[PDB]
């Protein structure tokens with residue numbers, strides 16, 4: 286059912302009142318999903334897999350979350366439908382056999398919605414004021430966390446880790462208004478907003494964890510940052526500065542080389558190539574060094590294998606990845622939940638996975654935004670603090686109440 290832009294989408298989402306819904310932007314389309322026809326839910330410590338459809342609830346064996354995810358995609362209530370997904374930070378720990386302190390958000394949900402609205406401008410097919418935020422607060426404690434990471438790195442425990450900070454927000458956030466105002470101020474590779482079981486998140490994702498089309502897998506590490514928060518002369522001065530800063534270039538190439546190794550774990554030998562090498566990517570309040578790496582999936586590997594290797598983005602966790610994940614759980618004192626996780630859209634053509642950064646989250650107990658910086662041996666705490674505030678300025682100025 287057919288009909289003959291972002292305001293309209295935003296208003297539609299307000300009429301979705303308290304209902305569960307999923308918004309995903311992948312240009313040229315905006316995807317809106319409402320309700321729940323089938324869902325796989327993995328709880329926060331990965332001890333229970335619950336499947337729900339109209340017929341009932343089931344518990345599924347959860348020895349392998351990836352295997353539950355495969356089971357869901359091949360289910361008869363699911364096959365051939367678009368699936369909207371979220372993957373919490375701690376999915377990595379669980380998949381890798383690394384002890385972790387469980388947060389409160391699920392490790393993984395996949396949902397087939399009951400109703401869908403697809404905007405392919407300026408049409409749509411149907412299927413069936415701002416909160417002031419002080420991003421400097423608690424910076425001294427954060428610079429201490431960075432100093433700890435730098436010392437651990439220089440002792441040789443690991444090479445890179447993303448240390449992040451949560452900013453608690455004073456009041457709850459109007460999701461559709463924030464979506465509208467926040468998006469016009471950003472140029473993300475994806476946008477998302479999801480509401481589910483009392484939890485909400487929205488954000489403007491700066492990079493893909495992963496995209497798979499047929500047999501081709503692509504990942505898009507971004508690493509290395511300057512502001513683009515001044516006039517155009519200041520911005521292009523910052524662009525040049527970024528392309529020639531040896532610390533940012535080094536951070537970038539170390540991440541790209543780990544993305545390559547990761548893909549070689551799941552791809553045909555000799556198929557892994559860098560298609561775009563360290564170009565600047567504009568992302569609202571910041572601009573980033575970005576590369577694109579691609580390969581051909583081996584015969585015995587599927588998109589979930591690739592996602593398990595690629596998740597979380599190197600550029601959100603660290604190098605080597607497992608040691609970085611351990612450092613993150615020792616250093617950070619609040620659960621990341623969905624921050625540095627992934628948003629998924631899965632359909633006929635594609636497995637699509639966006640990194641959850643530049644995002645806001647709220648549930649029954651917490652309401653917060655979150656940002657991190659990639660710490661290497663050369664890092665300076667003051668600079669990394671400032672960098673988090675540059676990233677937070679991608680979302681904080683546009684949190685509507």
Ligand SMILES: [Fe+2]
Pocket residue numbers: 508509510536658659660672
């Ligand atoms: Fe950085």
